[PDB]
């Protein structure tokens, strides 16, 4: 009966920024108060909805976008932002309703000697649309001379490794981010609250 939240917060393996995993969870009872008072997170910014009174509302269909970014890019996960993650990796709409949950995960997502398993898109041609997933890996045509498949010059590889070193600063550590989209409509709601 209870909604499964042990696969989006306690997942042993997360995904990269450009390949974030979207999970549809409906027809369940979901209590959100057990995450606020848990005191095991770092940011619990609820956009549109409030951090409280969310256990007394029935939602139509909520999602759970999970990915791993660095500490200096957590502010870009918000409605109406700019930079590199909100432009080419993960874009949030201006009317986004939900809560952005993030917590430090340097204790397990920082391999000794540089963890090269998490990637992020450095630059693309156009900006990313809200809730769009671009997993393309072709070289980025820059400059003026077309490379036509080869890397060479003026054509760089779009993906880039983070390099999560265990001995980094407070801004160069992994931060697992879970984005819940409380989609509300006049249709019969399925995700109710206690």
């Amino acid at each position, epitope marked *: 009966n209870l909604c499964p939240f042990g696969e989006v917060f306690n997942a042993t393996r997360f995904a990269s920024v450009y390949a974030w995993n979207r999970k549809r969870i409906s027809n369940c009872v979901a209590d959100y108060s057990v995450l606020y008072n848990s005191a095991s997170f770092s940011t619990f910014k609820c956009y549109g909805v409030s951090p409280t009174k969310l256990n007394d509302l029935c939602f139509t269909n909520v999602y759970a976008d999970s990915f791993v970014i660095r500490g200096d890019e957590v502010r870009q996960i918000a409605p109406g932002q700019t930079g590199k993650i909100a432009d080419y990796n993960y874009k949030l709409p201006d009317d986004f309703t939900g809560c952005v949950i993030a917590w430090n995960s340097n204790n397990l997502d920082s391999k000794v000697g540089g963890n090269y398993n998490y990637l992020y898109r450095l630059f693309r041609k156009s900006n990313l649309k809200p809730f769009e997933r671009d997993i393309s890996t072709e070289i980025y045509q820059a400059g003026s001379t077309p490379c036509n498949g*080869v890397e060479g010059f003026n054509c760089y590889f779009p993906l880039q490794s983070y390099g999560f070193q265990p001995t980094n600063g407070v801004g160069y550590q992994p931060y697992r981010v879970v984005v819940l989209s409380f989609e509300l409509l006049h249709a019969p709601a399925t995700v109710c609250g206690p």
Partner: antibody
Amino acid sequence: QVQLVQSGAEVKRPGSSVKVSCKASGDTFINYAFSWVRQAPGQGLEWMGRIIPILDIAHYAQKFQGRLTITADKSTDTAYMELTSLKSDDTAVYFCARVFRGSQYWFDPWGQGTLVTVSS
Amino acid sequence: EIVLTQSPGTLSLSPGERATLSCRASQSINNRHLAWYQQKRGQAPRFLIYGAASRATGIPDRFSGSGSGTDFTLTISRLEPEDFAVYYCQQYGSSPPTFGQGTKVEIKR
């Protein structure tokens, strides 16, 4: 600077597997892909496969899809090669190349080659 | 695209005369995707020219290439006694890279 040091020769028995290493040095290991090319005695060069360390994906040839297993250790900067069910006509000099991370590429940096004999 | 053949095969040339190696394409490589190498006897191939027109870093001006769609030629003017090895062709216009046979430049005595 860039020195793709390989291992030595391997006197191997017919019908087995081999494990050759390619110590990648100089620049970074993830910013460059790695391909292996063999050279049969007197014959030309044959492109076997190519590994992408940043993506951990491999692309084999039509005659090697299902027989060659190439890995890439992103910790010690070493590329490995393994061939299952070696036959008698596989005695060749296997070279280690450092191709770029693209669909089309050239084999600019080479290694030293290993004269791995299979008909022992 | 899939096969590359050298015309000379074993080009005997004097120590100082200019060389002309030929490597005809097979399926009309579009963007002149062809590279040349220098595989010395008992050594690794040396990268010489990318794109059939632009030489690599450190390559002397004696090496030069041409060809647009189906026939590329390598020009080695003033051949020194050191450039006596096999020269292979390599195309990257398609997905699988294919090599050639190689021209063994031998001394003319």
